[PDB]
Amino acid sequence: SGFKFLFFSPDGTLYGVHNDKLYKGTPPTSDKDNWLARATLIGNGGW
Amino acid sequence: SGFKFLFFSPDGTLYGVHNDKLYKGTPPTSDKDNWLARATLIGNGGW
Amino acid sequence: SGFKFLFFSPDGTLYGVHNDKLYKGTPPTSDKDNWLARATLIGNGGW
Amino acid sequence: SGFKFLFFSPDGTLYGVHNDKLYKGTPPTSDKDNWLARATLIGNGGW
Amino acid sequence: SGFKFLFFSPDGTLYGVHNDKLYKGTPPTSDKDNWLARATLIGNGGW
Ligand SMILES: CC(=O)N[C@@H]1[C@@H](O)[C@H](O)[C@@H](CO)O[C@@H]1O
Ligand SMILES: CC(=O)N[C@@H]1[C@@H](O)[C@H](O)[C@@H](CO)O[C@@H]1O
Ligand SMILES: CC(=O)N[C@@H]1[C@@H](O)[C@H](O)[C@@H](CO)O[C@@H]1O
Ligand SMILES: CC(=O)N[C@@H]1[C@@H](O)[C@H](O)[C@@H](CO)O[C@@H]1O
Ligand SMILES: CC(=O)N[C@@H]1[C@@H](O)[C@H](O)[C@@H](CO)O[C@@H]1O
């Protein structure tokens, strides 16, 4: 399923909508980085 | 049904299309922030 | 119908694909702004 | 006849995926500009 | 199915989601460029 939206802010922060929730964080630089687990949850639903 | 589009302008304003309407505003400050309730309505339909 | 694509250029111009046509213009600032009626048509189809 | 992706690079170049091919070029400035006929094909398949 | 997302970071790095994996790299230079073969894998699943 994965993300519904996945996009950058002009400040370089990666944003994503995943299971109707909004997340942000620095983009991963390696495939061992569990991005979703460490991303900042900034929206609990509705996205 | 969530958003149809969700994207940034170059100055870091978040834009979104929700129920055919267009909204803009600073991005959510936390998961406590009801963005859609405070976003500026900039289009009533047709998006 | 609504837009198929709706996105910004780095100079802050809003671009949209609507009914296979490509449009650009300054983003709307209020819900009184009929954006599609004033946007510059820059592609008459195929988008 | 219908793009899959259509988006800007931060350097102002328009990118588009059309039928599994990737194209780039300066954005069109009028509806007389046949963009896809003059765009640089930078990817042939897999997009 | 090709890519699910395909988008730029603000410094001009191309990001893409392909078969649930996240890749980044300089954008394709020409159709001689096998982008997916040389892109950096930065996320293995979940995208
Ligand atoms: C699209 C939108 O604004 N969603 C928000 C959600 O992110 C936030 O967690 C909640 C707090 O009450 O309010 C809204 O539902
Ligand atoms: C896509 C578009 O330009 N929609 C606008 C809408 O946002 C605005 O509220 C209305 C004002 O009359 O005109 C148009 O319908
Ligand atoms: C996808 C694309 O390049 N479409 C263009 C269209 O925008 C333009 O109005 C027309 C002019 O002849 O040529 C092409 O159809
Ligand atoms: C998604 C991707 O990297 N596609 C490329 C394609 O654009 C390029 O023309 C071809 C060259 O052999 O290699 C790959 O298929
Ligand atoms: C959406 C997300 O954060 N996916 C990551 C994936 O990129 C990474 O390869 C994996 C490491 O085990 O962790 C998570 O699955």
Residue numbers in the entry:
A (entry chain E), B (entry chain B), C (entry chain A), D (entry chain C), E (entry chain D): 2 to 48
Kindly provide excerpts from the paper associated with this entry.
We describe complex formation between a designed pentameric β-propeller and the anionic macrocycle sulfonato-calixarene (sclx8), as characterized by X-ray crystallography and NMR spectroscopy. Each blade of this β-propeller is a 47-residue monomer of ∼5.2 kDa (yielding a pentamer of ∼26 kDa) that binds one equivalent of N-acetylglucosamine (GlcNAc). The Asn33Lys mutation makes the protein cationic, with a calculated isoelectric point, pI ∼ 8. As is typical of β-propellers, Pent has a toroidal structure with a funnel-like central channel.
The unusual crystals that grew in Tris-HCl at pH 8.8 diffracted to 1.7 Å resolution. These data were solved in space group P212121 with an asymmetric unit comprising one Pent. Despite the presence of 2 mM sclx8 during crystallization, there was no calixarene in this structure. This result can be interpreted in light of the crystallization pH, which is almost one unit above the calculated pI of Pent. Under these conditions, calixarene complexation is apparently switched off as the protein is anionic. This structure is further interesting as the crystal packing interfaces are distinct to those found in the Pent–sclx8 forms I and II. Furthermore, intramolecular noncovalent bonds such as the Lys5-Trp48 salt bridge are preserved in the Pent-only structure.
